[PDB]
């Protein structure tokens, strides 16, 4: 098998077992990793299902490649410790993590200078007796309040709101989207996800506002 | 579709999918016709222009003749292209010699045996090549050939375009025959295949059906018995479908094996299972459901409704199959199970004997008989059939045609006339066959692979002449032993002799051993098909009417057997010994050797013992039974046994015809001279062999009988006799055997010798890589290590060891195949088998020849009680060796007071002829008449023993 | 034991072809001229491959150059829908791939003109569709268009061929279905010579015939090169005749 | 495990010869059940650099 690892005798394999409009909720915390230079923490529960995951910066790294007139963003999302999302599943959110902030962060300031993000979907609670969708517009809050924390050029507190396995990402309080995702629901429910996206959008922006000018 | 090439050829696409595993493998082949395609005929002369060379550089043999049977016209001149089925139904008609000597084979009927039976596709792989002046058998490759063939058709089954591809193929043929009259006869019994060719749909074509054929013979009167084909009580059922019986493999739903039908209950069988520990019974005639012993079949288990104390989900069965093996552990109540599919049928082809009251004397015509068949074990088969008249009193050959719905007993045709009841050539023959003996000549292909001479060859004398050396590259090794002085102890009625041997006396103290055998191998090469039946006769048999022989008759009697002053290539072996018999070296060697006489049995006893004959040979036959002993003992003292059985050999008076002198084989001194040093070929070179090849040598393993075989005699030597065996070692147990002799009979100690035979274990021969060491054992002659070495003839088993010898001198890079465990499993049990085939014949060979003496030459003798039973007591005469039981009523009268003990094993009464209150014990002596009377439901010549 | 028929008696294989016979051979020319210079497909009976070439020009790294002569590289890919039965896991760092990879780099180590071609690149694309059997001797007649595909300097014609053995029967140009059957030997025969420059044996292989063996495949080989080269002139000749 | 588990013995075909693969008892954690872990205390250490 793997050389590299401990990973036991191979004929033993893990333990079996059978059958024998709601609130969410944060807790976001920065500057607590001497590593990184920006940091954020993020507790989210809602109604069958807890959530915490960790955003963590590295930059601005050296670039070993070549010149470049500005900055370059890495994004990693990294499973914790008891859910398990696909490797390709993983990435193809990395994918549309990136082109946000390609709408966010003043590149121009940094020439030939990396940036790093590692997020960690670290433990996730789903009680409930396109389960990657529910939990992509909290990583763009947990992103930006440790870009943040780092302090890098940021043009807009800009996130994300939910309605029923769609993401909507906003700027300007919400006057102009920067990020769409959809996934199956009905047909023409546009207008009211539109809504009801926004005001948790609406919520969650004053919330990590909070979370800063009170520090 | 379809593309070209350059060459004028063609090239499309043949595609399917595998069904393999219940898969969906789609399987895509290219496929290409060529425009060189022969019609392989003698009249036609233009497609022996087109004939090209092998990569082996030959133009192949155009053999169907100008000639055929003509016929009635619009018949004239033909010839016979078949139908599968035709074969299918009647492929021992195809082997009539008398008939149907020059058929097409197409590629698509060649392909259909191939798809439907292996063995059966053999036998027209065999025929096709062993076609003779008589008979010619080509195979057309049809869909090979562009010009007959076809495509898929649309909206079309496979079966559809077969019978046109075939109607396509007889198309061409006879438009490339008009030029010659010979016409094209296609056969079938496809009655919808008998239904488009009525308004005559395309071609102007010979579409006959069997019988519309056989009914256009000259001599179809001796054949049409060989054409194959209420009756009701309550119907049989059937037997599962395809998918059902693969649907049920897997789940562990069904179980095969193999199933054996009692013949003292002919309708209750048992079958060994590999999940299974206990003999599983199947009770019920529906439940053995129209199969035959010694099938392979497909078992389902029973309810336990129907479980024997002495559903519809496979859900319920396989929980009720762990509660079999509960059961199994109970042996209070066991299960049952029946037959719900079979594997395979053991069918062939079977001989056996009419019943009187099936035939009518006075009908002519066709009638139904039931054959009583030799296997005791299977049912009567209803033949209807013309000439039963004739063959009631005759031998015949079957063969089982099929069983239907309806039928109780099958339908099947009769295949070869053979000839009168207890006539001595006829039961000479099925001895042979229903013991599965090869007796049949050698074929032409076999005739092509002896060496070119003759009998006005010899060996040359020049071991260095160019083009003897052009004549043997390995010349090399090739010493001269001419100048050696041989002489072998062998029969009067021999002429397959295999030793050659002298002996020399070195004056360092000691005495030079030169052993000689056959080289045939030189000559028998892995490639030539006379091997091949060196592998499919196996062996030689030995009977006192004939020996048939598995060479040539040329080859192993003259021209490699080694006889006096002849030059003959043998395989040499060199051994110096003191006169402690303890070996200094041996010399693993060809050569070619030049002897003296090749004895009798008595006449190298007119030359050990006369002190007569004292020339420097004798002196060296006379260095030989003096160390010979040293062999007897320090084998024995090994510990080996050493029975006595004189199997009687049946001396049938030289004046008269069938025989009536019963005779004893006699073993004097010359057979302890030679046998002890063949067993030291058959281990010393075996003891070089392991050496040289541990993975793929020929051995020969014997195990221990053990006491379970021999407590049920040592009650018998208990409770009667006060005597026991020890069984703690072969020596110790065969000096508790040498202690088992009573003095006022010394033969004792030879009845007993003749009666531990029965449970002594089956050595076979095997390849060293299937098993360990002290499991080259040889339990009987107490050596670790055996083969068998010492004569090619009669044991193919030798041969190959000369042929893994052949590397171990370095002669020769050795053969593939003699070193492919895969191809040895495969021959180290059929080589036994074939030795089983052997003796079952050779006490056989007795047997009838026994069969005839007690026919009319009854006597008063003594017969020995081998068996008190309850039902009787079974005698045996030691001047006869044949058995019969003295049931209890012709045993004695009054059985009420016939008292049987199984402790005692005495069987206490007051006779038949008397009254006095006879104590029945074992082993004492007794008055006997004998006689023998052929059992007229069984045919069996049973000796007739009645007490006296 | 097999429950089909290897080789007739009458002389015919599984098609019925003759012991000394190919299969239907179709090279093509610049199929591909928008990917790159070197663009050539073949079709040897089922084995059918994409070959494609790129060169000679600038590396990605500084490192990865030199100053004397080209490079070569080797990309195989061998698609999970190759064969009948798909294979589970892919293949790009499989040992048994790299051997070839490595074989056909000496095998062209020695037509290139390395030398005039210095500081530069060459790069050899492989995409194996259809496989039918004969799967080494099929690449390198691949490579052999795609070079000359986009005329790189070279001395000669290398031609590639599987010739198998039934017990003693030479067999040109044998199959996937056959291969399992025998023991089969590949030779990369170059030009009209008789040097070699690929000879690989896995079967197990009884001597004596060899010498035999080697003789065969030379006779099939040059009829490659033959078939090769017209293929091109009838191409060769639509040029010219249409550009002109 | 299961009282009798369905996945019992199973039998596979060698060139003539056959085995038996032994039954596959797939033992099954309970959702609920549950005992604690039996440990060596008095061992058990702690670390310091």
Do not use: Q, W
């Given at each position: 098998q793997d050389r590299r690892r401990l990973l036991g005798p191979a004929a033993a394999k893990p333990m079996a077992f059978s059958n024998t409009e709601s609130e969410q909720e944060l807790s976001l915390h920065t500057g607590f990793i001497e590593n990184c230079n920006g940091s954020a923490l993020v507790e989210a529960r809602s109604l069958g299902h807890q959530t915490s995951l960790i955003s963590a910066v590295y930059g601005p790294r050296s670039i070993r490649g070549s010149f470049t007139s500005q900055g370059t963003i890495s994004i990693q999302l990294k499973n914790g410790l008891l859910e398990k999302y696909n490797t390709n599943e993983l990435k193809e959110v990395s994918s549309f993590l990136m082109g946000i902030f390609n709408s966010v962060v003043n590149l121009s300031r940094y020439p030939k200078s990396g940036i790093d993000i590692f997020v960690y979907l670290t433990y996730d609670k789903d009680l409930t007796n396109s389960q990657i969708s529910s939990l992509i517009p909290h990583c763009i809050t947990s992103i930006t309040l440790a870009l943040a924390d780092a302090g890098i050029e940021l043009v807009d507190m800009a996130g994300a709101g939910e309605a029923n396995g769609t993401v909507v990402s906003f700027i300007k309080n919400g006057e102009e989207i920067v990020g769409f995702w959809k996934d199956d629901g009905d047909d023409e429910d546009l207008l009211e996800c539109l809504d009801r996206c926004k005001e948790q959008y609406n919520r969650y922006r004053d919330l990590m506002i909070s979370c800063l000018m009170n520090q | 579709r379809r593309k070209r090439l350059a060459d004028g050829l063609s090239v499309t696409q043949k595609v399917f999918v595998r069904s393999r595993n219940g898969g969906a493998t789609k399987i895509v082949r290219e496929h290409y016709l060529r425009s060189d395609i022969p019609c392989l005929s003698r009249s036609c002369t233009k497609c022996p222009q087109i004939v090209v060379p092998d990569a082996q550089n030959e133009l192949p043999k155009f053999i169907l003749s100008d000639s055929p049977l003509e016929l009635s016209a619009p018949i004239g001149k033909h010839y016979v292209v078949l139908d599968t089925n035709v074969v299918l139904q009647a492929i021992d008609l195809l082997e009539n010699p008398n008939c149907f000597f020059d058929v097409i084979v197409p590629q698509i009927v060649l392909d259909e045996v191939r798809n439907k039976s292996y063995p059966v596709y053999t036998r027209l792989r065999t025929l096709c090549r062993d076609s003779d002046d008589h008979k010619r058998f080509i195979v057309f490759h049809n869909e090979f050939s562009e010009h007959t063939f076809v495509e898929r058709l649309?909206?079309?089954?496979?079966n559809d375009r077969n019978n046109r591809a075939i109607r396509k193929t007889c198309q061409w043929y006879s438009e490339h025959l008009k030029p010659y009259d010979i016409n094209v006869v296609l056969v079938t019994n496809d009655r919808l295949n008998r239904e488009a060719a009525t308004k005559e749909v395309e071609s102007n074509i010979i579409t006959k059906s069997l019988v519309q054929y056989i009914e256009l013979l000259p001599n179809a009167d001796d054949i049409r018995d060989s054409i194959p084909q209420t009756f009701s009580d309550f119907t049989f059922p059937e037997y599962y479908s395809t998918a059902r019986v693969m649907g049920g493999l897997k789940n562990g739903v069904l179980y095969q094996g193999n199933i054996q039908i009692s013949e003292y209950n002919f309708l209750e069988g048992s079958v060994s299972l590999p999940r299974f520990s206990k003999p599983v019974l199947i009770v019920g005639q529906k439940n053995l459901n129209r199969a035959f012993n010694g099938d392979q079949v497909i078992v389902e288990l029973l309810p336990q409704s129907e479980w024997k104390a002495p559903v519809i989900s496979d859900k319920q069965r396989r929980l009720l199959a762990k509660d079999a093996m509960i059961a199994q552990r109970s042996k209070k109540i066991q299960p049952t199970a029946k037959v719900v599919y079979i594997q395979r049928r053991s069918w062939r082809q079977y001989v056996g004997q009419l019943a009187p009251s099936s035939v009518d004397p006075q009908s002519s015509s066709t009638q139904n008989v039931f054959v009583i068949l030799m296997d005791k074990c299977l049912p009567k088969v209803r033949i209807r059939t013309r000439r039963a008249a004739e063959l009631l009193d005759k031998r015949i050959v079957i063969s089982i045609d099929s069983w239907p719905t309806t039928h109780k007993y099958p339908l099947g045709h009769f295949v070869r006339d053979l000839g009168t009841i207890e006539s001595a050539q006829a039961e000479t023959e099925a001895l042979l066959l229903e013991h599965d003996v090869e007796y049949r000549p050698f074929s032409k292909k076999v005739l092509e692979?002896?060496?070119?001479?003759g009998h006005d060859w010899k060996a040359p004398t020049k071991l260095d002449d160019p083009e003897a050396v052009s004549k043997d590259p390995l010349l090399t090794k090739r010493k001269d032993l001419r100048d050696k002085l041989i002489c072998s102890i062998d029969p009067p009625g021999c002429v397959d002799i295999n030793d050659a041997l002298h002996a020399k006396k070195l004056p360092n103290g000691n005495w030079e051993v030169g052993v000689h055998i056959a080289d045939v191998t030189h000559f028998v090469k892995p490639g030539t098909a006379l091997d091949a039946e060196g592998a499919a006769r196996g062996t030689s048999v030995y009977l006192v009417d004939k020996r048939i022989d598995m060479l040539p008759m040329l080859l192993g009697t003259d021209l490699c057997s080694l006889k006096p002053y002849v030059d003959r290539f043998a395989f040499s072996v060199i051994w110096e010994l003191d006169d402690s018999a303890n070996i200094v070296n041996v010399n693993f060697m060809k050569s070619v050797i030049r002897s003296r006489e090749a004895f009798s049995y008595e006449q190298a006893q007119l030359r050990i013992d006369d002190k007569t004959q004292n020339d420097e040979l004798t002196m060296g036959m006379r260095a030989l039974l003096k160390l010979s002993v040293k062999l007897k003992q320090k084998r024995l003292e090994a510990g080996a046994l050493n029975l006595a059985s004189p199997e009687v050999k049946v001396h049938m008076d030289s004046e008269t015809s069938d025989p009536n002198e019963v005779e004893i084989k006699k073993l004097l001194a010359t057979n302890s001279l030679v046998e002890e040093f063949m067993l030291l070929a058959n281990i010393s070179v075996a003891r070089k062999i392991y050496d040289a090849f541990p993975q793929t040598a020929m051995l020969r393993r014997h195990a221990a009988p053990p006491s379970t075989n021999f407590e049920i005699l040592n009650e018998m030597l208990n409770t009667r006799k006060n005597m026991s065996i020890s069984l703690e070692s072969s020596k110790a147990l065969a000096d508790s055997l040498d202690r088992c002799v009573d003095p006022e009979d010394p033969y004792f100690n030879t009845l007993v010798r003749i009666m531990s035979t029965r449970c002594m274990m089956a050595a076979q021969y095997f390849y060293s890589g299937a098993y360990s060491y002290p499991d080259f054992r040889h339990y009987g002659l107490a050596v670790d290590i055996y083969t068998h070495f010492t004569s090619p003839i009669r044991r193919y088993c030798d041969v190959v060891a000369h042929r893994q010898l052949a590397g171990a001198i370095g002669y020769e890079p050795l053969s593939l195949t003699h070193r492919d465990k895969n191809k040895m499993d495969m021959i180290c049990r059929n080589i036994n088998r074939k030795h089983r085939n052997a003796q079952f014949a050779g006490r056989a060979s007795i047997e009838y020849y026994v069969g005839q003496v007690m026919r009319n030459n009854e006597s008063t003798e003594t017969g020995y009680v081998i068996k008190v039973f309850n039902n009787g007591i079974v005698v045996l005469v030691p001047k006869f060796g044949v058995e019969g039981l003295i049931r209890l009523d012709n045993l004695t009268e009054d059985p009420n007071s016939a008292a049987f003990d199984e402790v005692e094993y005495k069987l206490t009464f007051v006779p038949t002829n008397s009254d006095k209150?006879?104590?029945?014990?074992?082993?004492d002596k007794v008055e006997v008449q004998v006689r023998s009377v052929m059992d007229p439901i069984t045919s069996k010549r049973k000796a007739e023993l009645l007490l006296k | 034991m097999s429950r089909l028929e290897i080789y007739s008696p009458e002389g015919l294989r599984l098609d019925g072809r003759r012991w000394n016979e190919l299969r239907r051979f179709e090279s093509s020319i610049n199929t591909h001229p928008h990917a790159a210079d070197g663009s050539s497909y073949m079709e040897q009976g089922n084995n059918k491959i994409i070959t494609l070439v790129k060169g000679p020009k600038e590396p990605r790294l500084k490192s990865q150059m030199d100053t004397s002569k080209a490079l070569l590289n080797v990309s195989v890919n061998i698609t999970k829908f190759s064969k009948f039965e798909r294979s589970k896991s892919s293949h790009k760092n499989e040992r048994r791939v790299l051997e070839i990879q490595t074989s056909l780099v000496r095998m062209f180590e020695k037509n290139v003109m390395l030398n005039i071609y210095p500081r530069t690149v060459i790069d050899i694309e492989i995409h194996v569709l259809e496989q039918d059997g004969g799967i080494m001797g099929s690449l390198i007649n691949g490579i052999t268009l795609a070079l000359i595909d986009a005329g790189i300097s070279m001395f000669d014609y290398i031609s590639g061929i599987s010739v198998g053995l039934y017990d003693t029967t030479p067999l040109l140009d044998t199959n996937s279905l056959e291969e399992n059957a025998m023991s089969t030997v590949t030779l990369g025969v170059v030009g009209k010579s008789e040097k070699l420059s690929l000879l690989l044996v896995e079967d197990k292989i009884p001597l004596d015939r060899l010498e035999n063996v080697l003789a065969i495949g030379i006779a099939g080989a040059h009829r490659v090169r033959d078939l090769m080269d017209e293929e091109l002139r009838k191409h060769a000749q639509k040029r010219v005749s249409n550009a002109s | 495990i299961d009282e009798r588990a369905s996945d019992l013995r199973m039998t596979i075909r060698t060139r003539g010869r056959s085995a038996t693969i032994r039954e596959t008892y797939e033992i099954i954690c309970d959702q609920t059940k549950s005992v604690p872990l039996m440990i060596n205390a008095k061992n058990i250490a702690f670390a310091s650099n």
């Open positions: - | 649309p909206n079309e089954t496979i692979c002896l060496p070119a001479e209150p006879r104590d029945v014990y074992v082993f | - | -």
